[PDB]
Amino acid sequence: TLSILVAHDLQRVIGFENQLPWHLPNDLKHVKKLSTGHTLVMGRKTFESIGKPLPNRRNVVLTSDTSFNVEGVDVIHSIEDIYQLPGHVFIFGGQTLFEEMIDKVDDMYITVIEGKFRGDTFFPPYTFEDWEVASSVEGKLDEKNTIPHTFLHLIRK
Ligand SMILES: NC(=O)C1=CN([C@@H]2O[C@H](COP(=O)(O)OP(=O)(O)OC[C@H]3O[C@@H](n4cnc5c(N)ncnc54)[C@H](OP(=O)(O)O)[C@@H]3O)[C@@H](O)[C@H]2O)C=CC1
Ligand SMILES: CCc1nc(N)nc(N)c1C#C[C@@H](C)c1cc(OC)cc(-c2ccncc2)c1
């Protein structure tokens, strides 16, 4: 299985100055649940914005930099290398990788942040005409999660 995993706002904003424009604990819990034991694939900027691999899953970074070798990180150099990864593989970001992979994924796990943030990086446009709603779950609000959000699992038609 090849899946996208993304949090985007109402305008499909995903990033601002190599950070997430929002803090949402629930969505981190969502990601843990979903990806632990599996593989995450990310572009070099996405990785470098955190600088440390996520524990308890396979962290793969795509880059043209042939001297990239962070401990706990496996490296790939082409889009093609993705199809050679065994298991459930999550396209994890960022914008440029999402743009390359959106027409190739089986399904998408989208967290919709029901807000409008300033951004410089965006999830590619998509229409529901192409995607079946497998599930739509409204996120729960509290003191730690103050921003409305919806977990969408979308499967290609
Ligand atoms: N909200 C969310 O769910 C997510 C948001 N983000 C955000 O996205 C932003 C980063 O996005 P973006 O700027 O597009 O960068 P990316 O994370 O997509 O990384 C881009 C880099 O990945 C490498 N790469 C991509 N495609 C290829 C290829 N086909 N062959 C070889 N290398 C390739 C290149 O690295 P190199 O230059 O070294 O060759 C390229 O410069 C950040 O702001 C981050 O916060 C990221 C993930 C999720
Ligand atoms: C969760 C935010 C998020 N939510 C959703 N629904 N999809 C995503 N693809 C991302 C994402 C992402 C990128 C920016 C990322 C890469 C990374 O490299 C492994 C570590 C983290 C991270 C680890 C723990 N705490 C904060 C951030 C985030």
Numbering used by the authors: 1 to 157
Please give sentences taken from the publication describing this entry:
Dihydrofolate reductase (DHFR) is a critical enzyme in the recycling of folate cofactors that are essential for the synthesis of deoxythymidine monophosphate and several amino acids. Since inhibition of DHFR depletes the pool of available thymidine, it has proven to be an excellent drug target for rapidly proliferating bacteria, protozoa and cancer cells. Using high resolution structural information, we have developed a new class of antifolates characterized by a unique propargylic linker that shows activity against an expanded set of enzymes from important pathogens. Using a structure-based approach, a series of propargyl-linked antifolates were designed, synthesized and shown to possess highly potent antibacterial activity against both MRSA and S. pyogenes.
Interestingly, the structure-activity relationships observed in the biphenyl series did not directly translate to those analogs containing heterocyclic systems at ring C. Whereas the propargyl methyl and B-ring methoxy groups significantly impacted the activity of the biphenyl series, these substituents showed little effect in S. aureus DHFR across the heterocyclic series (compounds 24–28, 31, 36, 37). In order to understand the divergence between activity in the biphenyl and heterocyclic series, crystal structures of S. aureus DHFR bound to compounds 7 or 25 were determined. Comparison of the structures of S. aureus DHFR:NADPH:25 and S. aureus DHFR:NADPH:1 reveals a dramatic reorientation of the hydrophobic regions of the pyridyl series relative to the parent biphenyl analogs. In fact, a different enantiomer of pyridine 25 preferentially crystallizes relative to the enantiomer observed with 1. This new configuration forces a change in conformation for the nicotinamide ring of NADPH in order to maintain π-π stacking as well as a change in the conformation of Ile 50 that interacts with the proximal aryl ring. The stabilizing solvation of the pyridyl nitrogen at the opening of the active site drives the reorientation of compound 25 relative to compound 1. One consequence of this reorientation is decreased contact between the B- and C-rings and the active site residues, which is reflected in the slight attenuation in enzyme inhibition. In order to evaluate whether the compounds are bactericidal or bacteriostatic, we measured the minimum inhibitory and bactericidal concentrations (MBC) of compounds 24, 25 and TMP in strain Staphylococcus aureus subsp. aureus ATCC 44300. From these results, the MIC values match the MBC values for compounds 24 and 25, with both values equal to 0.078 µg/mL.
